[PDB]
CSV table of C-alpha atoms and ligand atoms in Angstrom, one decimal:
chain,number,residue,atom,x,y,z
A,1,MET,CA,132.8,226.5,180.0
A,2,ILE,CA,131.7,222.5,178.4
A,3,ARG,CA,127.8,221.9,179.0
A,4,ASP,CA,126.1,218.6,179.9
A,5,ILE,CA,124.3,217.9,176.9
A,6,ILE,CA,120.8,216.2,178.0
A,7,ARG,CA,119.8,212.8,176.7
A,8,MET,CA,116.5,211.4,174.4
A,9,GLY,CA,113.8,211.5,177.0
A,10,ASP,CA,114.3,214.9,178.6
A,11,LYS,CA,111.4,217.3,177.6
A,12,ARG,CA,113.1,219.9,177.0
A,13,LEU,CA,114.5,218.4,173.8
A,14,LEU,CA,110.9,218.1,172.3
A,15,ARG,CA,109.9,222.1,172.7
A,16,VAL,CA,110.0,224.3,169.7
A,17,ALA,CA,112.7,227.2,170.4
A,18,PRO,CA,112.0,230.3,170.5
A,19,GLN,CA,114.3,233.1,168.5
A,20,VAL,CA,117.5,234.0,169.3
A,21,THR,CA,116.9,238.1,170.2
A,22,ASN,CA,120.4,239.0,171.2
A,23,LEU,CA,122.6,239.2,168.2
A,24,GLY,CA,126.1,240.5,168.9
A,25,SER,CA,125.8,240.4,172.7
A,26,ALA,CA,128.7,239.4,175.1
A,27,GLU,CA,126.1,236.4,176.8
A,28,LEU,CA,125.5,235.2,172.8
A,29,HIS,CA,129.0,235.2,172.0
A,30,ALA,CA,129.7,232.7,175.7
A,31,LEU,CA,126.5,230.7,174.9
A,32,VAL,CA,128.4,229.6,171.0
A,33,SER,CA,132.1,229.7,172.3
A,34,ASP,CA,130.3,227.1,174.8
A,35,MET,CA,128.9,225.1,172.2
A,36,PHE,CA,131.8,225.1,170.3
A,37,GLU,CA,133.5,223.5,173.2
A,38,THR,CA,130.9,220.9,173.9
A,39,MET,CA,130.7,220.2,170.5
A,40,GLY,CA,134.7,219.3,170.5
A,41,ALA,CA,134.3,217.8,173.4
A,42,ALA,CA,131.5,215.3,172.7
A,43,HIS,CA,132.8,215.2,169.3
A,44,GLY,CA,130.1,216.1,167.0
A,45,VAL,CA,129.7,217.6,164.0
A,46,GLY,CA,127.1,219.6,165.1
A,47,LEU,CA,125.3,221.0,168.4
A,48,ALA,CA,121.7,222.1,168.9
A,49,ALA,CA,121.4,224.8,171.6
A,50,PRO,CA,118.5,222.6,173.2
A,51,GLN,CA,120.7,219.7,173.4
A,52,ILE,CA,122.2,221.6,176.3
A,53,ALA,CA,119.2,222.6,177.7
A,54,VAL,CA,118.8,226.4,176.2
A,55,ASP,CA,115.7,227.2,174.6
A,56,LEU,CA,117.0,229.2,171.4
A,57,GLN,CA,117.5,229.0,168.3
A,58,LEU,CA,120.3,228.0,168.0
A,59,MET,CA,123.5,226.2,166.5
A,60,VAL,CA,126.8,225.1,165.7
A,61,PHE,CA,128.6,223.1,163.3
A,62,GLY,CA,131.7,222.5,161.1
A,63,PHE,CA,133.7,218.8,160.3
A,64,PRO,CA,133.8,216.1,152.9
A,65,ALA,CA,134.4,219.3,154.7
A,66,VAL,CA,131.6,221.4,156.3
A,67,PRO,CA,132.4,225.4,157.6
A,68,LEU,CA,132.9,226.0,161.2
A,69,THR,CA,129.8,228.0,161.7
A,70,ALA,CA,127.5,229.4,164.1
A,71,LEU,CA,124.2,229.9,162.7
A,72,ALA,CA,121.0,232.0,165.1
A,73,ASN,CA,117.3,232.0,163.9
A,74,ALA,CA,117.9,229.3,160.8
A,75,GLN,CA,115.3,228.7,158.5
A,76,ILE,CA,115.9,226.1,155.8
A,77,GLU,CA,114.2,225.1,152.1
A,78,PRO,CA,115.0,222.5,150.4
A,79,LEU,CA,115.8,223.4,146.5
A,80,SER,CA,114.3,220.1,144.9
A,81,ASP,CA,112.6,216.5,146.3
A,82,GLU,CA,115.9,214.8,146.3
A,83,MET,CA,116.3,212.7,149.1
A,84,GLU,CA,119.5,210.8,150.0
A,85,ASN,CA,119.9,208.1,152.7
A,86,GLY,CA,123.0,208.6,155.2
A,87,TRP,CA,124.1,207.3,159.1
A,88,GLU,CA,123.6,209.3,161.5
A,89,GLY,CA,124.2,209.2,165.5
A,90,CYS,CA,122.8,212.1,167.8
A,91,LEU,CA,124.7,212.9,171.4
A,92,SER,CA,121.6,213.0,173.0
A,93,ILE,CA,120.9,208.8,172.0
A,94,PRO,CA,125.1,207.9,172.4
A,95,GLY,CA,125.5,204.8,171.3
A,96,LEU,CA,123.0,204.7,168.6
A,97,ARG,CA,123.4,204.9,164.7
A,98,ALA,CA,120.0,204.6,162.0
A,99,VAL,CA,120.2,205.6,158.3
A,100,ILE,CA,118.3,208.8,158.0
A,101,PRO,CA,116.9,209.9,154.7
A,102,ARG,CA,117.2,214.0,154.4
A,103,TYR,CA,116.8,216.2,151.3
A,104,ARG,CA,120.6,216.1,149.2
A,105,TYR,CA,119.9,219.9,148.6
A,106,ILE,CA,119.5,223.0,150.9
A,107,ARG,CA,119.3,226.6,151.2
A,108,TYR,CA,119.7,227.6,155.2
A,109,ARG,CA,119.2,231.5,156.4
A,110,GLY,CA,120.1,232.8,159.5
A,111,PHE,CA,122.4,235.2,161.5
A,112,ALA,CA,126.1,234.7,162.8
A,113,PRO,CA,126.7,236.0,166.5
A,114,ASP,CA,128.0,239.2,165.6
A,115,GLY,CA,125.1,239.7,163.7
A,116,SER,CA,125.9,239.2,160.2
A,117,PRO,CA,123.0,237.5,157.5
A,118,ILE,CA,124.1,233.7,156.6
A,119,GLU,CA,122.6,232.6,153.5
A,120,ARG,CA,124.1,229.3,152.2
A,121,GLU,CA,123.4,226.5,149.8
A,122,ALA,CA,124.6,223.5,151.2
A,123,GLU,CA,124.5,219.9,149.8
A,124,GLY,CA,125.0,216.2,151.0
A,125,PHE,CA,126.4,215.7,154.4
A,126,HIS,CA,126.7,219.5,155.2
A,127,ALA,CA,123.3,219.9,154.3
A,128,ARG,CA,122.7,216.8,156.2
A,129,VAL,CA,124.3,218.3,159.3
A,130,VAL,CA,122.0,220.9,158.9
A,131,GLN,CA,118.7,219.4,158.9
A,132,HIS,CA,119.7,217.4,162.2
A,133,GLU,CA,119.6,220.3,164.1
A,134,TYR,CA,117.5,222.2,162.8
A,135,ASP,CA,115.1,219.4,163.7
A,136,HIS,CA,116.3,219.6,167.2
A,137,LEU,CA,115.0,223.5,167.1
A,138,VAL,CA,111.6,222.1,166.8
A,139,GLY,CA,111.6,219.3,169.0
A,140,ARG,CA,112.4,216.7,166.4
A,141,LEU,CA,114.7,213.5,167.2
A,142,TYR,CA,116.2,211.2,164.0
A,143,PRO,CA,114.6,208.3,165.5
A,144,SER,CA,110.7,209.1,164.1
A,145,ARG,CA,112.8,209.6,160.3
A,146,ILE,CA,113.7,205.9,160.6
A,147,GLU,CA,112.5,204.6,157.7
A,148,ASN,CA,114.0,201.6,157.7
A,149,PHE,CA,114.8,199.8,161.2
A,150,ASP,CA,117.0,196.7,160.2
A,151,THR,CA,119.7,199.8,159.9
A,152,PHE,CA,118.8,201.2,163.6
A,153,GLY,CA,121.5,199.7,166.1
A,154,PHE,CA,124.7,200.4,168.1
A,155,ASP,CA,127.6,202.0,166.4
A,156,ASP,CA,130.1,198.7,167.8
A,157,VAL,CA,127.8,196.6,166.4
A,158,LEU,CA,126.2,197.7,163.0
B,1,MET,CA,125.7,179.1,181.7
B,2,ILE,CA,125.0,182.6,181.4
B,3,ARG,CA,124.7,183.6,178.3
B,4,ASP,CA,125.7,186.6,175.7
B,5,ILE,CA,122.5,188.9,175.4
B,6,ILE,CA,123.1,190.1,171.7
B,7,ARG,CA,122.3,193.8,171.4
B,8,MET,CA,120.4,195.7,168.2
B,9,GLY,CA,122.2,196.2,165.1
B,10,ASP,CA,122.8,192.9,164.9
B,11,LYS,CA,121.6,191.2,162.1
B,12,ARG,CA,120.9,187.8,164.0
B,13,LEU,CA,118.0,190.0,165.7
B,14,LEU,CA,116.3,190.4,162.3
B,15,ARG,CA,116.1,186.8,160.7
B,16,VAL,CA,112.9,184.8,161.1
B,17,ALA,CA,113.5,181.5,163.7
B,18,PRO,CA,113.1,178.1,162.2
B,19,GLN,CA,111.0,175.9,164.3
B,20,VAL,CA,112.3,173.9,167.5
B,21,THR,CA,112.3,170.2,167.0
B,22,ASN,CA,113.9,168.6,169.2
B,23,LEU,CA,111.3,168.8,171.9
B,24,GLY,CA,112.2,166.5,175.4
B,25,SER,CA,115.6,166.7,174.4
B,26,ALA,CA,118.6,166.8,176.9
B,27,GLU,CA,120.0,169.4,174.8
B,28,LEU,CA,116.9,171.9,174.8
B,29,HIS,CA,116.3,171.9,178.7
B,30,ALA,CA,120.2,172.4,178.7
B,31,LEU,CA,119.5,175.8,176.6
B,32,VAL,CA,115.9,176.5,178.1
B,33,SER,CA,118.2,176.3,181.7
B,34,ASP,CA,120.3,179.2,180.2
B,35,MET,CA,117.3,181.1,179.3
B,36,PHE,CA,116.2,181.2,182.4
B,37,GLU,CA,119.5,182.0,183.7
B,38,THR,CA,120.1,184.7,181.2
B,39,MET,CA,117.1,186.4,181.9
B,40,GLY,CA,117.3,186.7,185.6
B,41,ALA,CA,120.9,187.7,185.9
B,42,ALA,CA,119.6,190.6,183.1
B,43,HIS,CA,116.9,191.4,185.1
B,44,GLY,CA,114.2,190.5,181.9
B,45,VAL,CA,110.7,189.5,182.4
B,46,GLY,CA,111.2,187.5,179.3
B,47,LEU,CA,113.8,186.5,177.0
B,48,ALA,CA,113.8,185.1,173.4
B,49,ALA,CA,116.5,182.4,171.7
B,50,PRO,CA,117.7,184.8,169.1
B,51,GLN,CA,118.8,187.4,171.8
B,52,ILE,CA,121.1,185.4,172.7
B,53,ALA,CA,122.2,184.4,169.1
B,54,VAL,CA,120.6,181.2,169.0
B,55,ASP,CA,118.1,180.7,166.0
B,56,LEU,CA,115.1,179.1,167.8
B,57,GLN,CA,111.5,179.5,168.2
B,58,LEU,CA,111.9,179.6,171.4
B,59,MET,CA,111.1,182.2,174.5
B,60,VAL,CA,111.2,182.4,178.2
B,61,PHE,CA,108.9,184.4,180.5
B,62,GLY,CA,107.6,185.1,184.0
B,63,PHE,CA,107.7,187.8,186.6
B,64,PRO,CA,100.7,191.8,188.0
B,65,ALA,CA,102.7,188.1,188.4
B,66,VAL,CA,102.9,185.9,184.6
B,67,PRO,CA,103.8,182.5,185.5
B,68,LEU,CA,108.0,181.1,184.4
B,69,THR,CA,107.2,179.2,181.6
B,70,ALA,CA,109.2,178.0,178.4
B,71,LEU,CA,107.5,178.2,175.2
B,72,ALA,CA,108.9,176.4,172.1
B,73,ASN,CA,107.6,177.1,168.7
B,74,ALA,CA,104.6,179.9,170.1
B,75,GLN,CA,102.1,181.3,167.9
B,76,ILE,CA,99.9,184.1,168.7
B,77,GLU,CA,96.2,185.4,167.6
B,78,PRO,CA,94.8,187.9,169.0
B,79,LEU,CA,91.4,188.3,170.8
B,80,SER,CA,90.0,191.1,169.8
B,81,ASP,CA,91.3,194.4,168.4
B,82,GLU,CA,92.1,196.2,171.7
B,83,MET,CA,94.9,197.5,172.0
B,84,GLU,CA,96.6,198.8,175.2
B,85,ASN,CA,99.8,201.3,175.4
B,86,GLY,CA,102.6,200.4,178.2
B,87,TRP,CA,106.1,200.7,178.9
B,88,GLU,CA,109.0,198.4,177.4
B,89,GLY,CA,112.4,197.9,176.8
B,90,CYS,CA,114.6,195.6,175.1
B,91,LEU,CA,117.4,193.7,177.1
B,92,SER,CA,118.7,194.3,173.4
B,93,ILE,CA,117.9,197.9,174.0
B,94,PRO,CA,119.9,198.3,177.7
B,95,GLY,CA,119.3,202.2,178.8
B,96,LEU,CA,115.8,202.9,176.2
B,97,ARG,CA,112.2,202.4,176.7
B,98,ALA,CA,109.4,203.6,175.1
B,99,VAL,CA,105.5,203.5,175.2
B,100,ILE,CA,104.5,200.8,172.7
B,101,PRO,CA,100.5,199.4,171.8
B,102,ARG,CA,100.0,195.6,171.6
B,103,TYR,CA,96.8,193.9,171.7
B,104,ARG,CA,94.8,194.0,175.3
B,105,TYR,CA,93.9,190.2,174.9
B,106,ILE,CA,95.8,187.1,173.5
B,107,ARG,CA,95.9,183.0,172.8
B,108,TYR,CA,99.4,181.5,172.7
B,109,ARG,CA,100.4,178.1,171.4
B,110,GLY,CA,103.3,176.0,171.7
B,111,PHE,CA,105.3,173.5,173.1
B,112,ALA,CA,106.9,173.3,176.9
B,113,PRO,CA,109.9,172.3,176.4
B,114,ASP,CA,109.4,168.3,177.7
B,115,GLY,CA,106.5,168.3,174.4
B,116,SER,CA,103.7,169.4,176.5
B,117,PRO,CA,101.3,171.3,174.7
B,118,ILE,CA,100.5,174.8,176.0
B,119,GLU,CA,97.7,177.2,175.3
B,120,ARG,CA,97.1,180.6,177.1
B,121,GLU,CA,94.6,182.7,177.2
B,122,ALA,CA,96.6,185.9,178.3
B,123,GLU,CA,96.0,190.0,179.0
B,124,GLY,CA,97.3,192.9,179.5
B,125,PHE,CA,101.4,192.4,181.1
B,126,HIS,CA,100.9,189.1,180.5
B,127,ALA,CA,100.1,189.6,176.8
B,128,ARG,CA,102.4,192.1,176.5
B,129,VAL,CA,105.5,189.9,177.4
B,130,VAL,CA,104.6,187.1,174.9
B,131,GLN,CA,103.8,189.3,171.8
B,132,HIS,CA,107.3,191.2,172.7
B,133,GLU,CA,109.2,187.7,172.8
B,134,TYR,CA,107.5,186.7,169.9
B,135,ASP,CA,108.5,189.7,167.7
B,136,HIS,CA,111.9,189.0,168.4
B,137,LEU,CA,111.2,185.5,166.7
B,138,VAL,CA,110.2,187.2,163.2
B,139,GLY,CA,113.0,189.7,163.3
B,140,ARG,CA,110.7,192.6,164.7
B,141,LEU,CA,112.1,194.8,167.6
B,142,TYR,CA,109.8,197.4,169.3
B,143,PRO,CA,111.4,200.9,168.2
B,144,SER,CA,109.8,199.5,164.5
B,145,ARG,CA,106.6,200.1,166.7
B,146,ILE,CA,106.2,203.1,168.6
B,147,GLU,CA,103.6,205.4,167.2
B,148,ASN,CA,104.7,208.2,169.9
B,149,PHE,CA,108.1,209.6,169.5
B,150,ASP,CA,107.9,211.4,172.5
B,151,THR,CA,108.2,208.8,174.4
B,152,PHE,CA,110.6,207.1,173.4
B,153,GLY,CA,114.6,207.9,175.8
B,154,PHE,CA,116.5,206.7,178.3
B,155,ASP,CA,114.8,205.1,181.6
B,156,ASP,CA,117.4,207.0,183.8
B,157,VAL,CA,115.8,210.5,182.3
B,158,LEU,CA,112.2,209.8,180.6
C,1,LIG,C1,125.2,213.4,161.0
C,1,LIG,C2,124.2,214.7,161.2
C,1,LIG,C3,124.5,215.4,162.1
C,1,LIG,C4,124.8,214.5,163.5
C,1,LIG,C5,125.2,215.6,164.4
C,1,LIG,C6,125.5,214.8,165.4
C,1,LIG,C7,125.9,216.0,166.8
C,1,LIG,C8,124.5,215.8,167.5
C,1,LIG,O1,124.0,215.3,167.8
C,1,LIG,N1,124.3,217.0,167.1
C,1,LIG,O2,122.3,217.6,167.5
C,1,LIG,C9,126.8,214.1,165.2
C,1,LIG,O3,127.8,214.5,165.3
C,1,LIG,N2,126.8,212.8,164.7
C,1,LIG,C10,128.2,212.2,164.4
C,1,LIG,C11,127.1,211.2,163.3
C,1,LIG,O4,126.1,210.7,163.3
C,1,LIG,N3,128.5,210.7,162.0
C,1,LIG,C12,130.1,211.5,162.5
C,1,LIG,C13,130.2,211.1,160.9
C,1,LIG,C14,129.3,210.4,159.6
C,1,LIG,C15,127.6,210.3,160.7
C,1,LIG,C16,127.1,208.8,161.0
C,1,LIG,O5,128.8,208.5,161.6
C,1,LIG,C17,128.7,210.9,165.5
C,1,LIG,C18,129.1,211.8,166.5
C,1,LIG,C19,127.6,210.0,165.8
C,2,LIG,C1,107.1,194.4,178.5
C,2,LIG,C2,107.1,193.9,177.4
C,2,LIG,C3,108.4,193.0,177.9
C,2,LIG,C4,109.9,193.2,177.7
C,2,LIG,C5,110.7,192.1,177.4
C,2,LIG,C6,112.3,192.5,178.0
C,2,LIG,C7,113.0,191.7,177.9
C,2,LIG,C8,113.8,191.4,176.6
C,2,LIG,O1,114.4,192.5,176.2
C,2,LIG,N1,112.8,190.4,175.8
C,2,LIG,O2,113.3,189.8,174.8
C,2,LIG,C9,112.5,193.1,179.9
C,2,LIG,O3,112.2,192.4,180.5
C,2,LIG,N2,111.8,194.6,179.5
C,2,LIG,C10,111.9,195.1,181.0
C,2,LIG,C11,110.9,195.9,181.1
C,2,LIG,O4,110.6,196.6,180.1
C,2,LIG,N3,109.7,196.3,182.0
C,2,LIG,C12,110.0,196.0,183.0
C,2,LIG,C13,108.6,196.0,183.9
C,2,LIG,C14,107.4,197.0,182.9
C,2,LIG,C15,108.3,197.3,181.3
C,2,LIG,C16,108.6,198.5,181.2
C,2,LIG,O5,109.2,198.8,182.4
C,2,LIG,C17,113.2,195.6,181.8
C,2,LIG,C18,114.1,194.5,182.2
C,2,LIG,C19,113.5,197.2,181.4
């Protein structure tokens, strides 16, 4: 079932989401299913549970190919100090883009929907997507990370 | 003649505009006329010449009533350190609002389109409008002035 994506300005995007505690459940599987569907319909490369007003530490992503992944209770460690700029837009902020600095190299850990542990090293785009979806789980959006405001503008214009 | 308002992301909104040097001219009067018209059609309380891709130190405004004013070669002095928060949206950024801190009290100086000198003390909303239009003449947009990003979001949602 495709879900309504909520837009910036909604308080539910500013929460810090609790953990998933129903790994392996039919409810979690249905919810993840919906997230993949909602992501594909909206043409995103990532989607975070709060964007559909589900207050859960949960994200999906996949697209430099990134594997199709569902990740619960994500935690993230930078593997170095190196930052990299790249373009981002948020489906909660349709039409806009900015250049965002992110870690070039990360580790991420959590759980696949069935309970399998996931741990991966990621770089570049793969790392960016995960850092972006992570920010949602802690009530953080990309505009508060913009350093150069000349780069912030509408996609069709920029 | 109503003018197309250009949107954030356009480089022409990032310029520092030169001075008006044709006070009292038919060309300036036509341009100001157009600005008042474009402002009214877009339902704004202010409009700055760069927003219609005219690279000129020129703004219009008027709406706590603010008088209907056309102001060329504006310069602005704070009359105190006191800041005040208020909501703003920009016709170059349709749909969005944020809370922006501005001086509560200003002086502004320039010229009416016919050459008459204008100097005024302004406070609160009147002062905000002028500070906002001023920022456009120096390539500055409100998002780079946001302090609390929780307040940045879409009008219909916020
Ligand atoms: C890149 C950081 C990950 C962004 C995630 C968003 C989706 C989203 O809002 N997730 O929470 C997305 O798919 N955004 C895309 C995006 O920003 N892209 C697509 C490819 C490159 C990059 C900038 O263009 C498009 C739909 C705007
Ligand atoms: C308040 C600072 C002046 C903003 C000027 C803008 C117009 C603009 O983009 N000028 O350069 C406007 O009219 N914005 C309005 C606006 O921000 N308003 C209308 C009244 C109160 C305030 C916030 O709601 C509406 C159309 C979004």
